[PDB]
């Protein structure tokens, strides 16, 4: 599997 905990965010680049 490839299940993570701190999985990646969507459009976070717009913060």
* Alpha-carbon gap, residue 2 to 12, rounded angstroms: 22
First-to-last alpha carbon distance for the chain, in angstroms, is 31
Residues found in the chain: 15
Total H helices, total E strands in the chain: 0, 0
CA triplet 12, 15, 4: central angle to 5 degrees? 25
Structural method: NMR
Which residues, at least 6 apart from 11, have a Cβ–Cβ distance to it below 8 Å? none
What secondary structure letter does DSSP report for 14? G
């Amino acid at each position: 599997d490839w299940e993570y905990h701190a999985h990646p965010k969507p459009n976070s680049x717009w913060t």
